[PDB]
Structures are given as C-alpha cells and as structure tokens.
C-alpha cells in the first residue's frame, strides 16, 4: 500500500454537514500521515481519546472514520465522550469508550453571513437521546404535549430542527466551528490503515 489516507479531503472540504445530518467518510486501505494534525498552530481544538497524539504514526487500525459537521463554539465541548447537551443528546453522540481524536476550528470567515446563514441546522427536540454514532434525519413534528400533532406544527407541536443563523458579528461562543471526528476502529480483522512504515 502506497496511497496516503485522504485526510486533506475532510479537513479542507468546502462544505460541512449540519450536525443533525453529520457526514461520515470511511478511510481504509491507505497509509496515514497525521502531519496535518501536528502542523497546526493550536488556535485549533485538538483532543484525543484513548491513544496519544504522539503515538499515532506508530499505529495501525482496521478502519478510520472521519465524521464532520458544523456546530457553535459553545457546543464543541459536547463532542467528547460522557458529555450532555442538545448536540451530544440529539445530534451526535460519542460513546463512553471512544477511541479517536476530535479536531475543531473557527470557521466564521466561511460559514457566517451578514444576512444570517440558516443552512446549518441542529436537532433540538427528540423524545430520547441518541445512541453513540446514531444519525436522526427525521423531520416529523415533535409532540411536546399529550395531544397528537397530526403532522401540523403548533402548540406543543414543534418542528424538531432549528437553524444556527450564523452572523459574523456573533460572539465566539456563537460563531460557527467546523469539527472533524476521527474514530480509530480495531476489530479481529486485518489492519487497513497504518502510520508511516507502521
């Protein structure tokens, strides 16, 4: 195997998913150079879980997944095992035993608009928390009271998604952040993704 894992395709993608509809890329059968992580001047978020970021070029995995989405700055803390909040509960849930790294960076220059960007949505209402790595893209009306909604938004009957409405003058906690979650999976299977020269 001489092909490099396409980490650049994910971090430098022009468009990112809404968090409720988070995107997943399967990276396999490649050599991974984590140099894109190491050569960041750390106004970037960089927290890894289970393995250390130095020991990554000495590792092999059966599959790497790259999940990506946009959230608010105040919500980046929710992209971690054991967290709570609208995002962790209803949009993107990492498992307690997560092994991987979470990478995030401010994208105010790309994802805000003076007129407000309403393209990025998150799920605000759902009757149960997500399981880890669950993705709910339903837009059925949320029944917040005892009476049935019959598919009509109204009293106690709320459309479950809402827009972040990013504007460039927002405070940092409300500015958009792009997030990439790299998950490192290893099963009883031959390794497909390895560091340089393993």
């Amino acid at each position, epitope marked *: 195997i001489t092909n490099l894992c*396409p980490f650049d395709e994910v971090f430098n993608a022009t468009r990112f998913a809404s968090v409720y509809a988070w995107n997943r890329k399967r990276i396999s059968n490649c050599v991974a150079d984590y140099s894109v992580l190491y050569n960041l001047a750390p106004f970037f978020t960089f927290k890894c879980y289970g393995v250390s970021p130095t020991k990554l070029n000495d590792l092999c995995f059966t599959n790497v997944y790259a999940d990506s989405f946009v959230i608010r700055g105040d919500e980046v803390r929710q992209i971690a095992p054991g967290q709570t909040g609208n995002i962790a509960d209803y949009n993107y849930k990492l498992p307690d035993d997560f092994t991987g790294c979470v990478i995030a960076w401010n994208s105010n220059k*790309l994802d805000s608009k003076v007129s407000g960007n309403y393209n990025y949505l998150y799920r605000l209402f759902r009757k149960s928390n997500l399981k880890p790595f669950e993705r709910d893209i339903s837009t059925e009306i949320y029944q917040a009271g005892n009476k049935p909604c019959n598919g009509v938004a109204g009293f106690n009957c709320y459309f479950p998604l809402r827009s972040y409405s990013f504007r460039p003058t927002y405070g940092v906690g409300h500015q958009p952040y792009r997030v990439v979650v790299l998950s490192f999976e290893l099963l009883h299977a031959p390794a497909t993704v390895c560091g340089p020269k393993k």
Partner: antibody, heavy 127, light 108 residues
Framework: QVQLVQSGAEVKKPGASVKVSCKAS????????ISWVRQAPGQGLEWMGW????????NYAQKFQGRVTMTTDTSTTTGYMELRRLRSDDTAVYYC????????????????????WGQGTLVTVSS | EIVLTQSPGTLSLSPGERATLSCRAS???????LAWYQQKPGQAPRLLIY???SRATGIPDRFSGSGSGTDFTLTISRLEPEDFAVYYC????????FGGGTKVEIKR
C-alpha cells in the same frame, strides 16, 4: 520541487484527434487530482475537466463532454487528455495542473485551486 | 452557470501604487470556492489566493484576497515591476469557471 511536464507541441487538421500527456513528479500523485485548462491565443483561461488520480473518476465541462477523454497512469504518474473531433476553435495552449478543488478519493469540493501548472502544450488546428 | 466578470479589463497604475482588482459573479459564490491566478506573458498561471482570502504557498504578503457573495477583490498593497501581469479570478462553487482577466498595466 514539484514539476509537471507536458508533451511537446502538436499540429492537427480538423476532425483529427490529439492526446496530451502530463508527467507529474515530486508529490503524492494519488492524493491530488489533475485538472486540464486551455488558453486560446490572446484569450482567457477555459477549464476543460478534472480527473481523479485515485479512482479515475472524471468531471468535464459541458462544452467538451462528448469530445474529451481524460486518463491517468499511476505507474508513470502521468495524466492524459484526449480531445476528439477537433475544430479550428481548439487552437490553444493546453495546461495540466495539480488540482485541489475536488477530492481525489471522495470527489467533493475542496478549499483550494490549481497550485502547480505545466509549461503548456501548443496545439494548432488548421486545414 | 456562474459567470465571473472582472472590471476593468486593463488597469493602468504606477509602480508602487495600490492595485485593487474586482471580480463580480452572476450568482452568490461561496468564499471557500473562489481563487485568484497571475499569468505573466509567455508563462503559465500561478495560484495566488484560494478560499477567497488564503495566500498560496510562496506568494508575497502584498497580495491579499477579500470579498464575499457576488463581489470579490484582489489587492496588491504596493505594485512591484513583477506584479504587472494579467490576473484571473476563478470559482468552483458551481462547475468551474474563470473570469475574463484584468491586465495590470504600468501607467506612464
């Protein structure tokens, strides 16, 4: 230290076909797609298409969908552009460039441009 | 189809003066997908700005990219003799298209 070297000049008559090669060197070849751009003498730039060096997926401009065919060889790290049914309008310098506007693996748009450009190949079409 | 219109076609300026080139689009273009290129006579185009604002590798700091929506600008803070060339904006928000180019001419 990256260099993209293109084939020499070609002179063709209308209705013939031309194939231009582009030998890339000095970077991970399969991680970057190749984009082809031509420039008629005195005119602006005209994008022709994109090919993934990873899986061979191709994107072409509508102006050329039926006439252009792009190919890559991973062994020699070389891209190819074939343009059939040539016309006098096709008399232009043809450039290959390293593409960071679409992903070689997943095919989605990337934040970037044509960072490295070949020296260009002059193709003249006349009767 | 997104058509990029660069005005004026020829911009006459003295060396060391400040140059601001306009690129106007027929539709709103994501800043992530606008780029700028320089081409000197007889040479190949080279990438100056990508992502509307990011300077490419090895590009002097005097080159700057700005703008959003339909209106984008490339700024050269102080024109050097090497900066007098033709400049093309490029978008890949929808398909991929180039502008017509603006020639930066030495005013005399």
């Amino acid at each position: 230290q990256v260099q993209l070297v293109q084939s020499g000049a070609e002179v063709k008559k209308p209705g013939a076909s031309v194939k231009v090669s582009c030998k890339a060197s000095g970077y991970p070849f399969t991680s970057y797609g190749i984009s082809w751009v031509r420039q008629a003498p005195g005119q602006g730039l005209e994008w022709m298409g994109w090919i993934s060096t990873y899986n061979g997926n191709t994107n072409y401009a509508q102006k050329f969908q039926g006439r252009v065919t792009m190919t890559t060889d991973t062994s020699t790290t070389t891209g190819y552009m074939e343009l059939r049914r040539l016309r006098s309008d096709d008399t232009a310098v043809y450039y290959c460039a390293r593409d960071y506007t679409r992903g070689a693996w997943f095919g989605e748009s990337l934040i970037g441009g044509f960072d490295n450009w070949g020296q260009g190949t002059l193709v003249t079409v006349s009767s | 189809e997104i058509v990029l219109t660069q005005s004026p076609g020829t911009l006459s300026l003295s060396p060391g003066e400040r140059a601001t080139l306009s690129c106007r689009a027929s539709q709103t273009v994501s800043s992530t997908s606008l780029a700028w290129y320089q081409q000197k006579p007889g040479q190949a185009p080279r990438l100056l700005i990508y992502g509307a604002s990011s300077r490419a590798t090895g590009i002097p700091d005097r080159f700057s990219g700005s703008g959003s929506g339909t209106d984008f600008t490339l700024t050269i803070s102080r024109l050097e003799p090497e900066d007098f060339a033709v400049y093309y904006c490029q978008q890949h928000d929808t398909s991929l298209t180039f502008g017509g180019g603006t020639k930066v001419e030495i005013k005399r």
